[PDB]
Write a protein that binds this ligand. Structure first.
Ligand SMILES: Cc1cc2c(cc1C)N(C[C@H](O)[C@H](O)[C@H](O)COP(=O)(O)OP(=O)(O)OC[C@H]1O[C@@H](n3cnc4c(N)ncnc43)[C@H](O)[C@@H]1O)c1[nH]c(=O)[nH]c(=O)c1N2
Ligand SMILES: Cc1cc2c(cc1C)N(C[C@H](O)[C@H](O)[C@H](O)COP(=O)(O)OP(=O)(O)OC[C@H]1O[C@@H](n3cnc4c(N)ncnc43)[C@H](O)[C@@H]1O)c1[nH]c(=O)[nH]c(=O)c1N2
Ligand SMILES: Cc1cc2c(cc1C)N(C[C@H](O)[C@H](O)[C@H](O)COP(=O)(O)OP(=O)(O)OC[C@H]1O[C@@H](n3cnc4c(N)ncnc43)[C@H](O)[C@@H]1O)c1[nH]c(=O)[nH]c(=O)c1N2
Ligand SMILES: Cc1cc2c(cc1C)N(C[C@H](O)[C@H](O)[C@H](O)COP(=O)(O)OP(=O)(O)OC[C@H]1O[C@@H](n3cnc4c(N)ncnc43)[C@H](O)[C@@H]1O)c1[nH]c(=O)[nH]c(=O)c1N2
Ligand SMILES: NC(=O)c1ccc[n+]([C@@H]2O[C@H](COP(=O)([O-])OP(=O)(O)OC[C@H]3O[C@@H](n4cnc5c(N)ncnc54)[C@H](OP(=O)(O)O)[C@@H]3O)[C@@H](O)[C@H]2O)c1
Ligand SMILES: NC(=O)c1ccc[n+]([C@@H]2O[C@H](COP(=O)([O-])OP(=O)(O)OC[C@H]3O[C@@H](n4cnc5c(N)ncnc54)[C@H](OP(=O)(O)O)[C@@H]3O)[C@@H](O)[C@H]2O)c1
Ligand SMILES: NC(=O)c1ccc[n+]([C@@H]2O[C@H](COP(=O)([O-])OP(=O)(O)OC[C@H]3O[C@@H](n4cnc5c(N)ncnc54)[C@H](OP(=O)(O)O)[C@@H]3O)[C@@H](O)[C@H]2O)c1
Ligand SMILES: NCCC[C@H](N)C(=O)O
Ligand SMILES: NCCC[C@H](N)C(=O)O
Ligand SMILES: NCCC[C@H](N)C(=O)O
Ligand SMILES: [K+]
Ligand SMILES: [K+]
Ligand SMILES: [K+]
Ligand SMILES: [K+]
Ligand SMILES: [K+]
Lengths: 415, 415, 415, 415
């Protein structure tokens, strides 16, 4: 049994693909594999009060199909919360509600996802040219192989730690913050250092401040203060479906301009309201004569070592150009992520995938990796296209249109 | 040919009824009559900057059917503006855009509306008990009569002038502001009085201030200053579909409490931003030493007379308890509207419509007028239910649910 | 030793009087008596997130003297927080900070206030006509009497419980909320009813929701939901110094109009942001499937009785026109306050003090009670002038100008 | 007659210096010279709706002296606008009002500024080492020379045109926009190109859109859309008086970090509200089917030539890496400014001013240029210290503290 398409990973990106597949009139067979027990959308960072960074209109389907049974509006309606949500007049749902939306959409799907199923490798199918790939899936009980004419790799962002710092029992990456935090005794985390100046760092520091009245926090970041995230309407157009075209068709010079001017729409920046909330908290503590939030600006965490009852953090101060040590109980590195990279999963197939000048994967407008003639099977990327398709690649901005384009590309080829 | 339902008027209320009819699986015959040449949704007040007072989610259908082909979102999508609209992050479309939405929905409708067709009377059909009504329709060429088992009266708010003031060449009701304004020579309206403290008064004054840099405006209103319209989330729940039940089932005492506490969600109040824009304009004029906006507070317009080249407005000052005259070129009365009242149109049938203690029409939960057993045909009201169904009656808050309930009531009773 | 002026009470009103006395070139002797150990500005309601309802520019002096050493800006500067405060761009300080401001201003004052000094009575001085009053002061150790040519009564709002409900160990007025709350064991207040729909009720409910994750709260109020407080710029002008004149000189009819249109600037209303915060909290609980906030709308608390371990609250539902019982651990009545009334302290002196039609005290424009010719001593009111001077009377809106006018009145009469 | 200090230029910077001189107990003699007839604070850009980019608390004195007779608050109070301004609850005055504040402060000053007086050169006074400077002043009638022991150069930002583009009758710099615009027939500017993506470009485009209904505007800028200006509270701390020390004492690496992370607090960015106003305008034009605003993104103006009745603008498109021509009536270059540079005015004295590695003037913490021992006279810079003191140098953020520090430095040295 050869599938038209196999999806690796089941986050929002492949969920929207499943939705696109179901809504399409095209009869395409598919299978999806997720290594976790169920949809798990950055649960380590499901902090109380966490808000979506994207308007509810940018959901699984709406921009493609304005009357989808899988829209956020349909979800709210079924949950009997549409009226309540509309009364709020807020475009940005909480992360908790969006996580629900995903699970609700997944249940509504006809298809059935295979969970606890980790893709361990992707191999050339039989024959030359290669017309299919073999997908090696490992479950808790067994291992198996599925064959598909196309594969969509959507395995998500990859946590990045500071250079010279490794995760450990007392050094966590923000992506695992709640995993570790719920285990430890509250009275054992009285001193926390959080490295970073982005949304994760801000959200974690705010949470620590709100969670216990006596926690002391050291917010260590390279900027002089949090930088506001830009989602004003003109800059925000870089996330438009049509902006994918502008970026893709644009010269390298134009692509560089997008990053140079609008990186602050997503990377190393913090939502306005979270910034203001943090500033108010700091101010009130001052008024109360009980400061707890220590902002260590113009600085980088450069090392961590466990010394007895202390996690000893080495901090480099740019202002003085010298490093020094800071003792805390835990170091949380909210130091961001690297883009998805299909390389590892691809193995041997990588030989047939064409790279650019800077040694990155060449990808077509329809999200299909460029391959030599030796490979005829479609390898599509949802994620890992920052350099070809632009800043929407790792985000929720363009799920509906990308998934629709991928489905269309596959139908166009099959036939 | 007897219709299941005839709609009198084709504003948003009956348009949503048409949409509900089309989306219903029920096979119901219908005809709609609109006196005007086309949909004309308060065009007299289609001022340049005018905004909807209601979230775009409160459209023709969405609260009832979250995936309607007639939703505002579908409209934006077809107009290729959904992405642009989402970039704005504003729940409130302009009135211009919403007017378009109505015309777009009307065109999409399978049904064909009869324009230039004014319903002049509604009469008892043949037989006892009366099982149908006869609808007298006057067109420019002819007159005709159609028969229907049910009728939905949705003829809209009725302009209300101040007591002792009649409309004329130089005394306009706000509803006909742009009609008159476009005709006159700009250099002829250097002095305008606008009576009222509500949304219409504020929008007209702002427009006059923005339109020509020399116009002098007298804003005459009973309050000490504009009162803000309340649409904060808890108060705003009075517009919920479920709040219709609370109001309807509640005692007279509870109904009175809705008006006593939440009248300021809609009547005699002004949108926050329009208030602030007016205040900033007044302020800047002061800075410039060139005041143009004269706020005449704690006052009522009590009369108007034309004396030569002046419209002489009699103003009563509450503070001084005396009246005085103000000469301007034009008096605009933005003094509001009375609720729709089916009475006049009903003629003979009214005898069989049951009234309450205070002399108002009794109406059932499904919007159907209470009649004696002499009348078995359905008379439904969209509008004119302020006293039975509450503050959403004249508004766009609840189009989707009301139209759906009316259609359901009719299907139920057909059987 | 006869003082020119004696102040009864030492809240913001008399503090601003002391400031006005010190800034005045007039050499006036004075004494101030406060019954508490120190300035105590609604400490029972000093909740964690509580914000001023008035801009920082409306402080002790600024509207009168734009370069006062006692301004909020001077205070921030001295406290080395001016720059930090300005970075916030928020006109509204926290209540905690403002309480500090009062203390700071009081310390700066040359004059020494007499604390732990309760004024128990005010009596006629000697002579005919009466040219001074005798002020009976009770301290913990002794009692004494001081003599003054003028007296300024500023003893503040008086808590008002619902009719038929008395304060008790388990029935508290909001004004004493933190007093009682700090004593009780947290695990003993799992069920709280809060009566009222105003700022106090909303702040208390928000605090209870934020303070412990498992407290269940019943918010019982007559409206269908919180009504927003209006401070949009035109309505806000009722608080202008010049608006005192408009209200004072205006007919009774005009005075009624201020209340009829603008009572929502202060009474039975809630700040926009606090409303939205509460709505978001309720929403998130619903998403989490763990509702804790129970809004009991269109209702009044009409009785309370303690039965065993339960406080039994009798609630009257307007919708059903029937009462019923609700069992909680504590009932908090956030049911507001009555205006200051000088009647009580005045005792015998009432006889020389003139009343109006509705039987209230007549007061001159300079805040001086109207007396017969037999009394020539000045009795001034800061508070209790709602009916003569308008809505600014109990508020902080007009401290600077009123205090300045009282001082001027006193200097004028001396001469 | 030798002055303690001579100020070159009389904008806000030297105006705040004069105020600091007057408030200081130090007896210092001074003279100020302004080339223009009066204070002229970017009048070329005094567009109708233009707002301050800085809180009113950052005025001529307040951060230094919280009770200055020259504060913005004092100004509002004298102008009987303080109450009105406070009702607005907006920290940002209009530019028109601020211009008024400057002139009001200037009039209140005891000192008399010398207008129509252009400093043409600064020369070494007699003797070695040089203890004074000679200041050559040119008036319309005469020329003269004054002698001073210190000089403060505050001559303002210098307009910068694009490389390869010169100003002319039809190519204007934004600084002279209104000068030219109020000298041309409205019906003659139907087509305007505005180069730039900063605050000036945005305001000019908005103004053109609002000013006439039929003007067509080409907004040409290198970014993909306007980038929002950051003034959220933590990033905004770079403007704190104390942040001057952090920047000054910090390593070059730290100074670079300020620019790398927080350039977007001022340069090449647009105020949030102006961005949104432009987006709403573009949207409504689209709805109306009458587009007028043409956004030419990822582009630079690289040349301009007059050809008959057309101004021919050469545009370079980064996306296509090619240039093309655009014909309009006028090209407005809102392409920014260069920092003040004392070099030209200094002439011979420059030999003795010490430069850094990158060829820029060394400046001490007290704003005094570093000189060799050959020069003992003080040369202070208000402006031109971006590289030593940071981003507040050309701004209004820190007038009060800088002027106070300069006065102090001068008193100290005279000592
Ligand atoms: C805390 C936080 C919060 C947000 C965001 C990021 C972060 C860190 N994002 C960006 C984020 O990337 C986006 O929300 C989605 O997670 C991306 O969808 P994907 O389906 O592509 O990856 P995603 O990371 O969601 O899913 C990948 C899945 O594949 C699985 N997987 C990995 N390897 C596998 C293998 N070998 N075999 C099988 N399964 C495998 C993973 O387990 C995972 O379930 C975001 N963006 C935005 O626009 N708005 C927002 O609000 C947010 N919110
Ligand atoms: C200026 C302005 C702006 C708004 C609003 C009011 C006003 C005055 N409203 C309220 C307004 O009532 C609502 O927008 C609808 O117009 C009500 O729908 P009907 O369809 O009920 O009225 P209308 O929309 O008033 O429907 C009446 C139609 O029937 C026709 N008609 C009447 N008698 C007839 C006859 N005998 N024969 C044939 N045709 C006849 C009329 O010509 C008219 O076209 C509003 N509410 C809200 O919630 N949000 C908002 O943004 C606004 N905006
Ligand atoms: C919780 C809360 C919060 C606010 C407000 C009210 C409440 C309940 N208010 C209104 C409030 O009335 C105002 O802030 C001041 O408290 C009023 O100033 P007074 O000096 O007149 O009375 P205030 O009540 O402040 O002081 C009266 C004093 O006299 C003392 N006293 C009474 N009898 C005495 C006696 N016989 N002898 C000696 N001393 C006696 C009392 O002990 C007390 O200290 C307000 N308004 C506003 O405009 N902005 C705001 O932010 C707030 N905030
Ligand atoms: C359109 C616009 C609007 C703003 C701003 C800039 C621009 C371009 N700015 C920044 C601006 O630089 C600041 O507002 C002041 O103008 C700086 O004050 P200065 O006194 O240093 O120079 P400024 O440019 O104000 O004045 C210098 C004066 O010296 C005169 N002069 C020059 N050479 C001379 C000579 N040889 N002899 C005699 N006189 C001479 C000039 O005539 C001029 O009057 C700003 N920043 C901010 O923080 N908030 C804001 O809102 C704004 N607003
Ligand atoms: N509520 C939500 O929906 C939510 C919450 C969290 C995250 N997200 C999303 O997830 C994505 C990632 O954001 P992120 O905050 O996780 O990471 P990020 O945006 O990449 O930012 C990481 C931060 O760490 C800093 N950093 C890196 N190395 C450091 C070091 N050695 N010492 C100190 N600081 C260091 C970075 O500074 P430099 O940039 O200068 O290197 C940057 O400030 C974004 O799309 C974000 O919006 C969303
Ligand atoms: N952009 C939009 O979508 C838009 C625009 C305009 C209107 N609307 C809607 O239309 C409906 C009605 O609004 P409206 O503003 O037209 O009417 P309105 O809300 O009833 O306002 C009427 C006003 O005129 C006053 N008034 C009455 N008689 C007067 C007199 N003799 N002299 C001076 N003033 C007098 C009223 O005072 P009193 O209240 O004290 O009696 C009140 O201030 C509302 O639902 C509104 O939201 C919407
Ligand atoms: N952060 C702050 O600075 C702050 C905090 C709290 C209060 N304040 C100020 O203090 C003043 C008073 O505010 P407030 O909230 O204490 O009192 P309030 O404004 O007088 O409100 C009292 C509320 O209780 C309701 N009520 C009365 N009797 C009731 C009953 N038997 N059962 C249920 N509800 C009942 C009232 O309803 P009805 O209107 O229908 O009578 C009203 O909603 C205001 O000036 C306010 O701004 C300021
Ligand atoms: N970090 C998420 C950015 C989302 C973007 N503003 C968008 O509207 O798609
Ligand atoms: N609840 C106090 C209201 C204060 C009023 N808005 C003022 O500006 O004075
Ligand atoms: N472009 C002017 C920026 C001013 C700065 N945000 C400040 O508050 O000082
Ligand atoms: K499923
Ligand atoms: K004095
Ligand atoms: K001096
Ligand atoms: K002067
Ligand atoms: K002078």
């Amino acid at each position: 049994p050869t599938h038209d398409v196999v999806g690796v990973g089941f986050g929002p990106a492949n969920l929207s693909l499943a939705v696109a597949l179901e809504e399409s009139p095209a009869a395409l067979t598919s299978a999806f594999f997720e290594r976790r027990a169920s949809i798990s959308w950055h649960q380590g960072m499901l902090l109380p009060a966490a808000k979506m960074q994207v308007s509810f209109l940018k959901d699984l389907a709406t921009f493609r199909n304005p009357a989808s049974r899988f829209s956020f509006v349909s979800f709210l309606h079924e949950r009997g919360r549409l009226v309540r949500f509309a009364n709020n007049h807020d475009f940005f749902p909480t992360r908790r509600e969006f996580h629900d939306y995903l699970e609700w959409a997944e249940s509504k799907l006809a298809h059935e996802v295979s969970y606890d199923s980790e893709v361990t490798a992707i191999r050339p199918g039989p024959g030359r040219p290669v017309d299919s790939v073999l997908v090696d899936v490992s479950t808790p009980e067994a291992t198996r192989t599925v064959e598909a004419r196309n594969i969509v790799i959507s395995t998500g962002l990859v946590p990045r730690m500071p250079a010279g710092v490794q995760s450990d029992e007392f050094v966590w990456h923000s992506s695992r913050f709640l995993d570790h935090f719920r285990d430890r005794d509250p009275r054992s985390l009285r001193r926390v250092a959080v490295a970073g100046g982005g949304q994760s760092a801000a959200e974690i520091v705010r949470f620590l401040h709100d969670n216990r009245p006596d926690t002391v926090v050291h917010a260590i970041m390279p900027s002089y203060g949090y930088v506001v995230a830009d989602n004003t309407p003109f800059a925000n157009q870089i996330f438009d479906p049509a902006a994918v075209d502008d970026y893709f068709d644009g010269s390298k010079q134009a692509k560089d301009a997008f990053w140079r001017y609008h990186r602050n729409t997503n990377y190393s920046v913090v939502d306005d309201e979270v910034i203001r909330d943090l500033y108010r908290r700091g101010y009130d503590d001052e008024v109360a004569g009980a400061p707890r939030l220590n902002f260590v600006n113009l600085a980088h965490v450069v090392g961590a070592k466990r010394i007895a009852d202390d996690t000893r953090v080495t901090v480099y101060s740019m202002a003085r150009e010298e490093s020094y040590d800071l003792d805390v109980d835990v170091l949380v590195c909210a130091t961001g992520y690297d883009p998805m990279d299909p390389g590892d999963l691809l193995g041997e197939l990588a030989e047939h995938c064409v790279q650019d000048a800077e040694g990155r994967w060449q990808v077509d407008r329809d999200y299909r990796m460029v391959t030599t003639p030796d490979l005829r099977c479609g390898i599509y990327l949802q994620g890992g296209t920052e350099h070809t398709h632009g800043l929407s690649s790792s985000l929720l901005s363009n799920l509906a249109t990308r998934s629709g384009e991928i489905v269309s590309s596959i139908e166009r080829r099959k036939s």
